[model samples]
Target: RMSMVVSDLTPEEFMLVYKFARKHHITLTNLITEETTHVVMKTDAEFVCERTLKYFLGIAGGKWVVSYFWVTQSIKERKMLNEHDFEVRGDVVNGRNHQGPKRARESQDRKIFRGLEICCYGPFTNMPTDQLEWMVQLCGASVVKELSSFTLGTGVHPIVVVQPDAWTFHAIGQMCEAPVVTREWVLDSVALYQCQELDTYLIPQIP
Candidate 1:
């Protein structure tokens, strides 16, 4: 009767498996809560979760991570920052140094593998029109760098996400080869240009 009516697995074992799957949902919920809290609180370091852009957050080492790819462009969107009627959009400036037609049309699979949303620091504010345009474009460039480095590195990987909005850009970099200056650097450069206190660090981090 056992062989004919049921498979090799026992009924008791099947029940256990069913119960475990149900309980697994609760376990996953608890994990997600803890992870989100950690991400919100930890602002001094970079983190890339295995899930797609679900959680990519961090502080800048020196250079601005946003400038690596997407070109920053401003458009007359209904939304506004600081009561100014403008919104920021990232125009695909270039990726992997590819500006040609064949490469330009390549779609970025950020959703399935990485999800979306990469948050970072600001000083992205108060940027001039041309500079912000550059910022938007540079972000795409940075993503390419991060992905390439992850592929060649010693198991360490960077996060991938959708293009960030007009906020600060945060990310990790090869300490030896970081690609851009932090927003602070940009501000300091602006200040110096105006003869303000020279906020200079000797070992400048620019990529």
Candidate 2:
């Protein structure tokens, strides 16, 4: 379970949210020194407020910031809700409002794999399944944990990452007609911040 660090909430608001968190066993913690991946606040305006403080370092440090309602609503169901629906994006420090849509528009360009599906299996050098899937999704592709020859004919583009050997790998190799490539294909594509054609990364067939 992931823990959360909350900022910008008043003592009154934090008290109630903490109670909800404790009831749900959600593990909420204080800010600044708290080492957590998710940061919670009351609103986006509060997000900007933190952006003006040293808390901005948390956002720049690759942490996700969500709204406090996520805590309350998750408590309402006794389960954590989707953070995406409650996400808050950090903004300019000076609040000039000049670098608004232009920067936002450029972010769309990074989604080079839009409309594609990508998945990976087997041990990678340093990449774990969850980490790899996160990058695949970051590039605008959905992650498919399992695929079969049946799925190949569905008309959606599918890409698979696998080691060139081993049991389940050969299963996908023989079962898939889609681009079956090594894990570096994903690493390389993410580095370029764009999808690459697969020939160079494609796993070779029997000699």
Q: Supply the global lDDT for candidate 1.
A: 0.23
Over 4 Å off, model 2: 1-105, 149-155, 164-171
TM-scores for every predicted model = 0.17, 0.44
Candidate with the greatest TM-score versus the true structure: 2
- Residue 51 lDDT in candidate 2: 38
- Error of model 2, residue 103, in angstroms: 11
lDDT of 2 by residue, 1-207 (tens): 666677778888788778877876766776433356666766654333333222332332344556677777787787768876665543433342322222222455546567778777656644346756665675577788776532555657888887554333545566556667886566545433346679887776532
**Ten residues in sequence with the least summed lDDT for candidate 1:** 52-61
* Model 1: per-residue Cα lDDT over 104-147, one tens digit each: 11222211112211122233344443343233222232233333
